Amino acid sequence: SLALSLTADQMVSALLDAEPPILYSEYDPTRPFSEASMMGLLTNLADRELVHMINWAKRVPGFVDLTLHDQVHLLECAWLEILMIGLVWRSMEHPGKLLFAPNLLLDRNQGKCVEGMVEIFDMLLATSSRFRMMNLQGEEFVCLKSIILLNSGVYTEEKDHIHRVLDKITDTLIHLMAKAGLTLQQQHQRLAQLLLILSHIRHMSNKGMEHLYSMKCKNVVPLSDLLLEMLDAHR
């Protein structure tokens, strides 16, 4: 594998260069919010982001070395986690606000427009507050998002290579923190703090998947074909 031959600086550069763009919402500011229109805005955005995420995943070192079936499974498991860590990252410097898009900045009060979504908004806002209290760096963020991609579905022969790349990302993270002047004790501590966030990101994705499944069954929001298939993969 060629991904295993990368140094830490090359890994960061490859991950930073693969970064997807920040998409805009279809938000019509004149249109008063309904539960249907807000869920429509969120799912339309997610559908367009999935296209860019798929092509981002291809540029994550080691991902293309996997069989096509293994790539499908990883993205099916992690897609909402990846979307959510992206949302939380975009929202870091917007306290009390979730930046789904540059033109779609929502607070917890606007989340009440959709039944059952405010509890998820509160969890994302708290994760954003945790990233801000940790001063999460962009180089650390791109490592974490790649870890989610490779880890979330790894337990649901050549998985040794997945674990090999995952270790290379751990190496990269320590490398970044070492370069930031952190002591050995502080490096492991920050490493641990960052990876425990992923447990909370799994939680919100689980909860967000159930919520999205409730809007589909209620026929509230017209879900796209790709989004429906990504949703059926969790049942």
Binding site: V51, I54, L68, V72, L75, D225, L226
Partner: peptide, 10 residues
């Protein structure tokens, strides 16, 4: 094939 499958295959 799944939509994801085709998009990954492109």
């Amino acid at each position: 094939h799944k939509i994801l499958h085709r998009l990954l295959q492109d």
